[PDB]
Amino acid sequence: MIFRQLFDSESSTYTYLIGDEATRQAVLIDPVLEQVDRDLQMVAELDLTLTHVFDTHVHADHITASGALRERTQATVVGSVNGASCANVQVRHGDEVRVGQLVFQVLATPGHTDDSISYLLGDRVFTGDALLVRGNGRTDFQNGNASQLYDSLTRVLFTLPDETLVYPGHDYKGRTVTSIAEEKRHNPRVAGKSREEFIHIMENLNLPRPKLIDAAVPANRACGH
Amino acid sequence: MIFRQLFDSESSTYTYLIGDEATRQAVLIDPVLEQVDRDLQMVAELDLTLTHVFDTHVHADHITASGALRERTQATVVGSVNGASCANVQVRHGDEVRVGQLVFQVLATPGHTDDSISYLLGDRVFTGDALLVRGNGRTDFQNGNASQLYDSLTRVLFTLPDETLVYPGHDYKGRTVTSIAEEKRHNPRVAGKSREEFIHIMENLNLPRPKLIDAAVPANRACGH
Ligand SMILES: [Fe+3]
Ligand SMILES: [Fe+3]
């Protein structure tokens, strides 16, 4: 497996490039529109071919590049059934997405948004804004739900093996990766917290409205158009 | 081996945490003073003990945390013989630094600075500002020399195995890692460039002086004191 983590300073978004060493097929997870040239340049120079693009959820902080990438490489766009309608492959819990020899298992992890999903790839999982490094995404927009996010964290993600690496969709403090074992112990909002305790925290976070939410959400519904 | 890459947005500096699974000894490479609490919290939560702190070179963009870390954990500060005098272990080309059962081989890679070195750990090398992702550090300050840097890249670093991962001290475009094979083929300043060609490029880069060099350099020669 060929693995590359990409960072977009503007939105603090993590883009993930996973390549299959057999078929040389590559997939970009949560790519950013402004970073299209960077991403494609990395794919080519690593001697891979972009055949898939995954979106963990409809983003409100950046414009997805899935649409722009599909125009350039004819890659398959994958998303939640509750996500962008123009996505070629719409997946739900239990589904699998084949990227060459790579088999991604789809995990439904709503809470941040109702269309939020996670991609399990063996020893690692890409969780988007559901599970972050020592935190989690907000639940006050995009039909978010604190109670639902608690289920996605404790029952869906935390049941994964301890050594499983967690690659989040964002980080604002310079952390690049965490693990399930780490979060089951040191997550300030979930570890030692009940559902009601977790709900009370999220409902009273008092955070400013997402900067690009009124622009990004409609655009990302159309795969960034 | 426990590996964690940390990013400091203010200086675009990459800090590297390498932990030994056997002895639980950990080392921080190029730690940032403003990120001391973050770094130590990561070391503890990963069940490790900071015993060593490496610095690739005297930095001109941020204050090193080696001194402050030495105050808290009594960690061994390692640096070049031309680096900070208050460093406990001063190394040169050919030397080895052992962090538990981890064996770091020291590679002398001047050019950016006269005290710039690289740490080889098996399948990966930490190059500081000598070799960057699709680039290299500037050679017009703190005893920098384009001729030396060309030699450090082509004769010292590029002779390492192709599959060797390269973890740079900085990146300003969101790239986290490259490899020797990639840079031998796609480095815009060295690939297909002679020594004289490379020198003339660096001689006329026309860059603004690092707006911290007058504060950071003398401070980092005192290990961030
Ligand atoms: Fe989000
Ligand atoms: Fe430097």
Beta partners for residue A7, in sequence order:
A14
Classify A144 as helix, strand or coil.
Answer: coil
Please answer whether residues A46 and A2 qualify as being in contact, where contact means their C-beta atoms are separated by less than 8 angstroms: yes
Cα–Cα separations (whole angstroms), residue B26 to A139, B53, B164: 37, 9, 22
Please answer whether residues A43 and A81 qualify as being in contact, where contact means their C-beta atoms are separated by less than 8 angstroms: no
Cβ atoms within 10 A of the Cβ of B144, count?
19
Spatial separation of the C-alpha atoms in residues A79 and A81, rounded to whole Å: 7
Spatial separation of the C-alpha atoms in residues B83 and B68, rounded to whole Å: 17
Report the relative pairing of strands A178-179 and B2-8 from DSSP bridges.
unpaired
Q: Measured between beta carbons, which residues in chain A are less than 8 angstroms from residue B182?
A: 45-46
Spatial separation of the C-alpha atoms in residues A139 and A130, rounded to whole Å: 10
Which of B9, B173, B182 shows the shortest C-beta gap to A174?
B9
What DSSP state is assigned to residue A100?
A: T
Classify A35 as helix, strand or coil.
Answer: helix
Report the relative pairing of strands A25-29 and A13-19 from DSSP bridges.
antiparallel
Spatial separation of the C-alpha atoms in residues A146 and A30, rounded to whole Å: 23
SS3 string, chain B, reads CEEEEEEECCCCEEEEEEECCCCCEEEEECCEHHHHHHHHHHHHHCCCEEEEEECCCCCCCCCECHHHHHHHHCCEEEEECCCCCCCCEEECCCCEEEECCEEEEEEECCCCCCCCEEEEECCEEEEECCCECCECCCCCCCCCCHHHHHHHHHHHHCCCCCCCEEEECECCCCECCEEHHHHHHHCCCCCCCCHHHHHHHHHCCCCCCCCCHHHHHHHHCCCCC
Asked how this structure was determined, the answer is: X-ray
Q: How far is B207 from chain A (nearest CA, A)?
A: 22
Q: Measured between beta carbons, which residues in chain A are less than 8 angstroms from residue B42?
A: 175
Q: Measured between beta carbons, which residues in chain A are less than 8 angstroms from residue B9?
A: 9, 174
Q: What share of chain A is helix, strand, coil (3-state, %, to 5)?
A: 25, 30, 45
Which of A38, A177, A185 shows the shortest C-beta gap to B4?
A177
Interface probe for B, chosen from A2, A4, A7, A36 (most Cβ of B below 10 Å), is A7
Spatial separation of the C-alpha atoms in residues B124 and A217, rounded to whole Å: 40
Which residues, including other chains, have CB under 8 Å from residue B110's CB and lie 6 or more apart? B116, B130, B145, B148, B149, B152
Tell the CATH topology of A1-225. Answer: Metallo-beta-lactamase; Chain A (3.60.15)
Partner-chain contact B6 A175, CB within 8 Å:
yes
Spatial separation of the C-alpha atoms in residues B24 and B44, rounded to whole Å: 10
Please answer whether residues A51 and A76 qualify as being in contact, where contact means their C-beta atoms are separated by less than 8 angstroms: yes
Q: Which residue in this structure is represented by tokens 């080696």?
A: B66
Which residues, including other chains, have CB under 8 Å from residue B69's CB and lie 6 or more apart? B28, B31, B36, B39, B40, B50, B53, B75, B77
Residue type, B118: S
Query: Quick one: angle between helices B36-45 and B66-73, nearest 10?
Result: 50
Q: How many residues does chain A have?
A: 225
Q: Quick one: resolution in A?
A: 2.5
Q: Please give the distance, rounded to the nearest whole angstrom, from the Cα atom of residue A93 to the centre of ligand 1.
A: 19
Q: Which of A222, A225, A213 is nearest to A62 (CA)?
A: A213
Spatial separation of the C-alpha atoms in residues B211 and B216, rounded to whole Å: 9
Classify A127 as helix, strand or coil.
Answer: strand
Q: Measured between beta carbons, which residues in chain A are less than 8 angstroms from residue B186?
A: 45
Q: Kindly state the tokens that stand for B134.
A: 């699709």
Report the relative pairing of strands B124-128 and A89-91 from DSSP bridges.
unpaired
From the centroid of its chain, how far is CA A224? 16
Spatial separation of the C-alpha atoms in residues A157 and A131, rounded to whole Å: 8
Spatial separation of the C-alpha atoms in residues A201 and A150, rounded to whole Å: 12
What DSSP state is assigned to residue A111?
A: S
| Surrounding residues of ion ligand 1, Cβ less than 5 A | A 129
Q: Where are the domains of chain B?
A: 1-225
Please answer whether residues B54 and B83 qualify as being in contact, where contact means their C-beta atoms are separated by less than 8 angstroms: no
Please provide the DSSP assignment of A199-210 as one string.
HHHHHT--PPPP
Q: Kindly state the tokens that stand for B90.
A: 């001063």
Residue type, B126: F
Q: Kindly state the tokens that stand for B66.
A: 């080696």
Q: Kindly state the tokens that stand for A3.
A: 């693995």
Spatial separation of the C-alpha atoms in residues A78 and A205, rounded to whole Å: 32
Q: Which of B9, B30, B8 is nearest to B18 (CA)?
A: B30
Q: Is B8 on the interface with A (CB under 8 A)?
A: yes
What DSSP state is assigned to residue A34?
A: G
